[PDB]
Write a protein that holds these residues in place. Structure first.
Motif, PDB file in Angstrom:
ATOM      1  N   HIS A   1      -3.228  11.038  -4.154  1.00  0.00           N
ATOM      2  CA  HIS A   1      -2.947   9.754  -4.806  1.00  0.00           C
ATOM      3  C   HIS A   1      -2.359   8.632  -4.066  1.00  0.00           C
ATOM      4  N   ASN A   2      -3.086   7.323  -4.124  1.00  0.00           N
ATOM      5  CA  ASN A   2      -3.344   5.222  -3.816  1.00  0.00           C
ATOM      6  C   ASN A   2      -2.829   5.341  -4.578  1.00  0.00           C
ATOM      7  N   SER A   3      -2.265   4.209  -3.960  1.00  0.00           N
ATOM      8  CA  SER A   3      -1.856   2.245  -5.186  1.00  0.00           C
ATOM      9  C   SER A   3      -1.914   1.301  -4.044  1.00  0.00           C
TER      10      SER A   3
ATOM     11  N   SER B   1       0.233   5.557  -0.103  1.00  0.00           N
ATOM     12  CA  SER B   1       0.122   7.316  -0.416  1.00  0.00           C
ATOM     13  C   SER B   1       0.713   7.933  -1.104  1.00  0.00           C
TER      14      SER B   1
ATOM     15  N   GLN C   1       0.543  -1.303   0.154  1.00  0.00           N
ATOM     16  CA  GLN C   1      -0.214   0.072   0.079  1.00  0.00           C
ATOM     17  C   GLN C   1       0.922   1.231   0.418  1.00  0.00           C
TER      18      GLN C   1
END
Length: 33
Positions: A18-20, A8, A6
């Protein structure tokens, strides 16, 4: 094999967010007789 990831990130008036994420789970076997 297994993984979880994870992340951000954040940064006229202007703004960005932003997130991934990532996941894996894998299994293998071999047998011989």
């Amino acid at each position: 094999h297994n993984e979880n990831q994870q992340g951000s990130f954040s940064s006229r008036s202007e703004n960005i967010n932003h997130n991934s994420a990532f996941k894996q789970a894998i299994q293998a076997s071999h047998k011989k007789d």
